[PDB]
Amino acid sequence: DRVLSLPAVSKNQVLENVFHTAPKAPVEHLEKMVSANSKVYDALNLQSKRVLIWQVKPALF
Amino acid sequence: LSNERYQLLSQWPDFTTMYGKDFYYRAHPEDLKKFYDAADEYYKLYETVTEFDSLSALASQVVPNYAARRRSTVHPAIGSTVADGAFTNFLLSKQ
């Protein structure tokens, strides 16, 4: 019964309790806000090719 | 209107300042699932409030019901307050 003197908690159960959640990448906040601000650039810039300014406040010709 | 919702996503606390492993390992493992779910939730809210190309198709859900109320058989500009005040001219005159 030498196995009953070993620590009963496995090496697996350490690695699943220590690394419980996959950690958040540092660049995940950049490349998710950049792709969402590329839609703020597109719609709202006045130099974008797809601006909303001509379909929101139309024109007066 | 989509600006008034974007202005309150401007006031969201910077959760990425708590992404380090000195916050990962001090925190309860279920309060870190919730913190990583509340950060994934902000990217859901922020990527849909900046979907401004979807506002043009939302305006076409307001137009056809409005335009049918203007196709009134009485008048395009008729309303209740005029048609009530023109009932007393009809009722409180003789027959």
Beta strand segments in B1-95, E: none
Tokens of A12: 């697996």
**Look-up of token digits 């005159």:** B93
**Look-up of token digits 């009953």:** A4
Residue type, A56: V
Tokens of A56: 């929101």
If you ran DSSP here, which 8-state letter would residue B54 be given?
G
Q: Tell if the CB–CB gap between A35 and B47 is shorter than 8 Å.
A: yes
Q: For testing the chain A interface, which of B10, B12, B41, B50 should be mutated: the one with the most A CBs within 10 Å?
A: B50
Alpha carbon distance A38, B20 (integer Å)? 27
Candidates B63, B15, B43; CA nearest to A39 is B43
Crossing angle between the packed helical segments B29-49 and A28-43, to the nearest 10 degrees: 20
Distant-in-sequence, close-in-space partners of B95: CB < 8 Å, separation ≥ 6: none
Tokens of B74: 């009485």
Q: Tell if the CB–CB gap between B21 and A36 is shorter than 8 Å.
A: no
Alpha carbon distance B46, B58 (integer Å)? 18
Tokens of A17: 């309790």
Structure-determination technique: cryo-EM
